[PDB]
């Protein structure tokens, strides 16, 4: 059953190069082509180019010509995409996809799982974790919102749980946003019964593996 398995996430500095792999299985690799398509965070899809495995012939997106190289190793059924002279706006999820040969219309019928490539000059940094404390200004008819602001970290990702995963209902952990500083921030909130506040403990568990930062923050009413 056709599968395309891509390599893991990458963090790179501007001016560096990245090489992503796409290991194919479940079909005769040398009979097909591979295309690469990327998706910047929150954006749409952008075709990067095409390679035919049989003869190694390539077609590249004009906005990338000179900077992108696609290869295949027909002995291992693996495709590679190298992108050089990286810039911050090369930050994207990069996908490989299978192209069927000899069709009047080219189409991408199976896709890899994607590889995130983050391009940034930022140094690895763990987050500060600040309480979003419940008060009467986050109290709404017997319910109260509380949360954790997970600020100024790099690179992605962080994980957030509440009470070691025992609290899930009413949790919203928002997508991270990239600040003008080059560091990420995100918030996790939960709504709970307002009568529970004095009588129950709320802990947001923040883990930032890249910096080996782990934080459990108790959020207490004001």
């Amino acid at each position: 059953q056709v599968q395309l398995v891509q390599s893991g996430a990458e963090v790179k500095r501007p001016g560096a190069s990245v090489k992503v792999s796409c290991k194919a299985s479940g079909y005769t690799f040398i009979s097909y082509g591979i295309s690469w398509v990327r998706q910047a965070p929150g954006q749409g899809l952008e075709w990067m180019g095409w390679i035919s495995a049989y003869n190694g012939n390539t077609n590249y997106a004009q906005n990338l010509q000179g900077r992108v190289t696609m290869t295949t190793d027909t002995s291992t059924s693996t495709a590679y995409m190298e992108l050089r002279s990286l810039r911050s706006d090369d930050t994207a999820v990069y996908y490989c996809a299978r192209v069927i040969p000899g069709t009047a219309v080219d189409y991408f019928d199976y896709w890899g799982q994607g590889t995130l490539v983050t391009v940034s000059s930022a140094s690895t940094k763990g987050p500060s974790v600040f309480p979003l404390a419940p008060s009467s200004k986050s109290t709404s008819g017997g319910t109260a919102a509380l949360g954790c602001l997970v600020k100024d970290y790099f690179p992605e990702p962080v994980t957030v749980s509440w009470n070691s995963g025992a609290l899930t209902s009413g949790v919203h952990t928002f997508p991270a946003v990239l600040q003008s500083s080059g560091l990420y921030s995100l918030s996790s909130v939960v709504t709970v019964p307002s009568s529970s506040l004095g009588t129950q403990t709320y802990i947001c568990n923040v883990n930032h593996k890249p910096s080996n930062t782990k934080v459990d923050k108790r959020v207490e009413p004001k």
Partner: protein, 214 residues
């Protein structure tokens, strides 16, 4: 040729069992060199239709495609739960191959006003020279919502960022956080911090506010 693919509408809401039609337009003639893909959050696209009207192997027969000149349509004859997703068209007529910007098909439900909460910056953070003020809009529908920050009644621009959850698996709502970032010195120059929320579930905008230092 740099071919621009447009899609209309950019978003629509539907219920299970609905007939759903999505439209794509190419900026120039592309014959039938037009494909349709489905994408769900966190996942890779999946091919639905190729060459304008050919159903991809394994794709259910409720999906169909048609073409008229530069206008293309994807039809779902009776929407099923697994069909809520973003749909993209893609032209293979001229390099660079280009995609439309996507049409998100979300779950129709009754209007739900947001429950709004505001959080002052923490004492901890203020010690570090910065103040983050957070406004939470919880469990609203539809997605369209406007958050305006006001500081001593002055409308803020350029100093906030907001992000949104995917539609909730239990109640089909959205939630949204808006964060206003100020230096400590700027935060200390003003007294009233307010988040004003406009949403069609509210007959009037809702303002949540605090006085700094209370």
């Amino acid at each position: 040729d740099d071919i621009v693919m447009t899609q209309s509408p950019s978003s629509l809401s539907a219920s299970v069992g609905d007939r759903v039609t999505i439209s794509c337009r190419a900026s120039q003639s592309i014959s039938s060199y037009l494909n349709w893909y489905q994408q769900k959050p966190g996942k890779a696209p999946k091919l639905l239709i190729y060459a304008a009207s050919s159903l991809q192997s394994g794709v259910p027969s409720r999906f169909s495609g048609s073409a008229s000149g530069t206008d293309f349509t994807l039809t779902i004859s009776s929407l099923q739960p697994e069909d809520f997703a973003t749909y993209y068209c893609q032209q293979s007529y001229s390099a660079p191959f280009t995609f439309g910007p996507g049409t998100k098909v979300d779950i129709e439900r009754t209007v739900a006003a947001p429950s709004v909460f505001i959080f002052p910056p923490s004492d901890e953070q203020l010690k570090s020279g910065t103040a983050s003020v957070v406004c939470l809009l919880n469990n609203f529908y539809p997605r369209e919502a406007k958050v305006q920050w006001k500081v001593d009644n002055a409308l803020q621009s350029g100093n906030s960022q907001e992000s949104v959850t995917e539609q909730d698996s239990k109640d089909s709502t959205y939630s949204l956080s808006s964060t206003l970032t100020l230096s400590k010195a700027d935060y200390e120059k003003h007294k009233v911090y307010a988040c004003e929320v406009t949403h069609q579930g509210l007959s009037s905008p809702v303002t949540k506010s605090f006085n700094r230092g209370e």
